[PDB]
Amino acid sequence: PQFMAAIYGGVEGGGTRSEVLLVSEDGKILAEADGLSTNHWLIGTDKCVERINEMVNRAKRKAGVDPLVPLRSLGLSLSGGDQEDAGRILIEELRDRFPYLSESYLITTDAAGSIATATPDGGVVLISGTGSNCRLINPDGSESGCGGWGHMMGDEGSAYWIAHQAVKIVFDSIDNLEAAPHDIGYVKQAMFHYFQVPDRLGILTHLYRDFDKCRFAGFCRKIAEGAQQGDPLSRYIFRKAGEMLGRHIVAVLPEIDPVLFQGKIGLPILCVGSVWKSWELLKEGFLLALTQGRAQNFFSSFTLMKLRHSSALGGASLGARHIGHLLPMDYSANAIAFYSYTFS
Amino acid sequence: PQFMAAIYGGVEGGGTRSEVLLVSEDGKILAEADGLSTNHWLIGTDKCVERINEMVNRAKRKAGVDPLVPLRSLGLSLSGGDQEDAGRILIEELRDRFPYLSESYLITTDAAGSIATATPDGGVVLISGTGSNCRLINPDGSESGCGGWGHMMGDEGSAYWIAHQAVKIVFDSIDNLEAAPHDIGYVKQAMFHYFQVPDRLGILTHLYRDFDKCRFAGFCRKIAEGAQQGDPLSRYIFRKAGEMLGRHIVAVLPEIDPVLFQGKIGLPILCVGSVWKSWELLKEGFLLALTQGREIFSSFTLMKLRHSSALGGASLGARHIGHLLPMDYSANAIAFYSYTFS
Ligand SMILES: CC(=O)N[C@@H]1[C@@H](O)[C@H](O)[C@@H](CO)O[C@@H]1O
Numbered sequence: 218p219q220f221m222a223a224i225y226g227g228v229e230g231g232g233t234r235s236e237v238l239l240v241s242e243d244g245k246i247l248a249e250a251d252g253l254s255t256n257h258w259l260i261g262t263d264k265c266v267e268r269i270n271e272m273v274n275r276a277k278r279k280a281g282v283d284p285l286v287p288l289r290s291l292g293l294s295l296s297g298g299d300q301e302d303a304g305r306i307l308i309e310e311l312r313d314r315f316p317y318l319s320e321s322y323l324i325t326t327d328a329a330g331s332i333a334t335a336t337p338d339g340g341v342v343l344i345s346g347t348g349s350n351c352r353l354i355n356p357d358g359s360e361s362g363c364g365g366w367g368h369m370m371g372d373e374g375s376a377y378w379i380a381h382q383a384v385k386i387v388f389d390s391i392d393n394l395e396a397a398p399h400d401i402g403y404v405k406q407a408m409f410h411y412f413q414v415p416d417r418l419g420i421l422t423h424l425y426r427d428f429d430k431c432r433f434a435g436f437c438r439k440i441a442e443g444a445q446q447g448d449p450l451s452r453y454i455f456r457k458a459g460e461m462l463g464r465h466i467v468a469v470l471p472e473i474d475p476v477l478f479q480g481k482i483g484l485p486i487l488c489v490g491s492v493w494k495s496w497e498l499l500k501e502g503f504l505l506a507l508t509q510g511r512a513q514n515f516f517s518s519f520t521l522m523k524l525r526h527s528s529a530l531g532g533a534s535l536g537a538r539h540i541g542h543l544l545p546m547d548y549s550a551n552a553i554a555f556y557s558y559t560f561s
Numbered sequence: 562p563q564f565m566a567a568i569y570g571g572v573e574g575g576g577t578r579s580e581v582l583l584v585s586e587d588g589k590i591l592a593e594a595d596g597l598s599t600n601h602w603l604i605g606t607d608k609c610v611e612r613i614n615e616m617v618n619r620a621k622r623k624a625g626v627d628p629l630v631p632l633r634s635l636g637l638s639l640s641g642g643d644q645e646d647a648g649r650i651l652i653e654e655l656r657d658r659f660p661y662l663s664e665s666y667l668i669t670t671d672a673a674g675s676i677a678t679a680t681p682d683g684g685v686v687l688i689s690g691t692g693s694n695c696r697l698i699n700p701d702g703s704e705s706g707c708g709g710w711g712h713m714m715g716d717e718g719s720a721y722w723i724a725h726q727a728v729k730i731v732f733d734s735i736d737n738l739e740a741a742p743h744d745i746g747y748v749k750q751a752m753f754h755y756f757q758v759p760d761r762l763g764i765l766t767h768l769y770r771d772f773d774k775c776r777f778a779g780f781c782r783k784i785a786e787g788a789q790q791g792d793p794l795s796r797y798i799f800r801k802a803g804e805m806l807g808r809h810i811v812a813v814l815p816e817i818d819p820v821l822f823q824g825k826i827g828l829p830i831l832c833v834g835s836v837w838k839s840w841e842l843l844k845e846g847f848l849l850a851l852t853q854g855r856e857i858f859s860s861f862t863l864m865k866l867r868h869s870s871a872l873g874g875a876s877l878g879a880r881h882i883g884h885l886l887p888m889d890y891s892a893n894a895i896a897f898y899s900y901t902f903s
C-alpha cells in the first residue's frame with residue numbers, strides 16, 4: 218500500500234532542525250527523515266523552500282514512492298507559519314520550483330502541529346528548545362498565546378535564553394555593572410571552553426557576524442551540566458528558566474476553556490522541545506511560578522505530557538484535513554504523562 | 562599650503578553614521594564630510610572599507626587635494642576598532658583596493674577618538690547614541706571600561722535600549738507575561754505609528770530579516786516625545802536609561818586615577834551621542850545612580866564636544882607617524898552640567 222493510495226506528508230519545522238513524516242491514507246507512518254532548520258524569520262523563504270523539498274524527497278525515496286509522483290498533501294508546521302506573506306510565498310515557490318513535490322500544501326505553526334499530534338479537541342502547548350512559545354487552541358477554535366517572539370524580543374526559558382543569561386551575568390559581573398547572584402567561576406570557565414576564546418571580546422564575533430542561534434544556544438548544555446553538578450549560579454539560571462516557563466502558562470490561564478481543566482489529569486500541558494529533558498532542573502522554578510501565579514479559580518491539578526511521535530504527524534493530519542481527508546490517529550499512543558501536580 | 566604640506570585625516574565611526582575631517586599639519590580643519598555607518602560587527606569589513614574610501618574621497622575633493630594624492634595618515638576611530646583581526650584586515654584591504662587613499666593608517670576605537678579630541682592627559686567618555694559605551698584612559702595609559710557590547714549583549718541607556726524597552730514592555734503587557742509599570746497606551750500607539758504596522762506580528766520582520774539597528778533605535782524619538790509631553794511610561798523609561806548610564810560611571814570609579822577627580826570642576830565626564838540631547842529626561846535617574854553608587858569623588862562636570870571626534874582621530878593618526886598635530890583642547894569641549902554631592 219504505497220503506490221495505490223494517497224500519501225500525506227508533514228514537516229515539523231521548529232528549532233535546531235526539521236523532521237518529515239510520510240503517512241498512508243490509513244494513518245501508517247511510511248518514512249521519516251531529518252532536515253535542516255526551516256525558520257523563515259532566521260533563514261528566509263528561499264532556503265526554507267530548498268530545504269523542505271530536499272528532505273521530503275529523501276523521505277519519498279525511503280518510502281519507495283515512484284519517481285515524480287507527488288504527495289497528495291503536505292502540512293508544513295513551521296516556526297512563524299502564522300505569517301500571512303511568508304506562507305503565501307513558501308507555497309508559490311514550492312509549486313513553481315518543484316512541481317512534483319505535492320499536489321497541495323498547508324502552512325501552519327509548529328505549535329499547531331504539536332497540539333494536533335496529541336489531540337483533536339483543543340489544548341495547550343509549551344515549547345522550550347532553542348526558542349520558547351506557549352499556544353492555546355480552545356475546543357471552539359479560539360486561540361491565545363504568550364511568547365514565541367524570538368531571540369530579539371523574548372524566548373524566555375529557552376536554551377537561547379539560558380545561554381544568554383549566563384553570558385550576560387558573566388559580562389556584567391566582570392564589568393562591575395551588576396553583581397552576580399552567585400559565584401561566576403564555573404560559568405565563566407565553561408563559556409571560555411565552549412566558545413573556545415580567552416576573553417569577552419572573543420565572544421562578540423559569535424554574537425554578530427558569526428551568530429547562529431543553534432550554535433549560541435548550545436551553551437545551555439554547559440549550564441545544565443553545571444547545575445547537575447551543583448554549581449549555585451547554574452542551578453539559579455535553570456530555576457529562573459523554570460519560572461519563566463510557568464509564567465507563560467499563568468499568562469494564558471484566563472483564556473483557557475474551563476472544560477480543559479476537568480478530568481482526573483487536570484490541565485494537560487504538552488511539553489515540546491529539548492529543554493524539557495532538564496525538567497528536574499526546571500521543576501522548583503516551574504512550581505514557584507504556577508503556585509504563586511494562580512487567583513481563587515480554575516484548577517486543582519495539572520499534568521505535563523510529552524509526545525511519543527514527531528509533531529510532523531500532527532502536521533500530516535492537518536495537511537490531510539486541508540483537502541477533506543480524516544487521517545486516522547491514535548491519540549493515546551501519541552503522547553504520555555511524565556509529571557503531575559496537585560496543589561493540595 | 563594644500564599641496565605643499567601633509568594632510569591628516571580622521572574618521573569618527575558613530576552609530577547611525579560616520580564623519581571624516583581632513584586637517585592640515587598645523588591643526589586647521591580643511592574639509593569635512595558625512596558617511597555611512599562603519600561598525601564592522603554589523604556590516605562586515607568589506608563594506609567598511611568601501612565606505613571609508615568613498616567618504617574620505619569626497620572630503621579630498623572638497624579640500625582640493627589633487628587626484629591620486631594620498632593623505633599622510635588616516636586615523637579611524639571606529640566601533641569595534643580594538644579587535645585585532647578586524648583592524649588588520651581593514652588596513653590590508655584599504656591598502657590593496659585603494660592604494661592612493663593614505664600612506665599610513667591607525668585603527669582605534671570611537672571612544673579613544675572622542676577622548677583625544679578633548680584632552681591629551683587622560684579621561685572618561687560616556688557614549689550614548691544608537692549604542693552605549695563607557696571608557697576610561699588614565700594619565701598613565703592604563704584603560705578600563707564598562708559596557709560597549711552592542712545590541713545582543715547590553716547597550717543599556719542607548720537609543721536602541723530605550724526603543725527595545727518600550728517595545729518589550731508593550732509585548733509583555735499584551736501577553737499578560739508582565740504588567741507594565743505605567744499605562745502603555747501612548748507607547749503602543751506610537752509603536753504602530755513609527756513602524757507602520759497594525760499589530761505585534763507586524764513588528765517582527767523589523768527585528769529579523771529586515772532588522773536595521775538605526776531604523777529600530779529611531780523609535781527612541783517617539784519615547785522622548787512622549788516623555789516631553791508627560792507620559793508616565795515614557796518618562797519612566799528615560800529615568801531607567803539615566804540610571805543605567807550612571808551605573809556605567811559607578812562601575813569604572815574604582816579604576817579612575819584620583820588625580821582626575823581633583824580640580825575646580827571635579828571629575829569631567831565627556832558625554833557623546835544623540836541621547837544626551839535628552840539630558841533633562843535622564844537627569845534624575847543619572848543622579849540617583851551616581852549618588853547611591855558613591856555610598857556603597859567630590860563633584861563632577863558633564864562635558865560635550867564642540868568638534869567631531871574625527872579631530873581626535875586625526876590627532877592620533879598623526880601621532881602614529883611621529884607628528885604632533887596642534888590641538889586647541891579648550892575650544893574642543895565645553896561643560897553643560899555641574900554637580901557637587903552633599
Ligand atoms: C520569531 C520567532 O522566531 N519565533 C519562534 C517561534 O515561532 C517558535 O515557536 C519558538 C519555538 O521554537 O521559537 C521562537 O520563539
Ligand SMILES: CC(=O)N[C@@H]1[C@@H](O)[C@H](O)[C@@H](CO)O[C@@H]1O
Pocket residue numbers: 421575576600602639640641671672688689690691692693694708709710711712716
Ligand atoms: C559590539 C558593538 O557594536 N559595540 C558598540 C561599541 O563599540 C560602541 O562604542 C557603542 C557606541 O556606539 O555601541 C556599541 O556598544
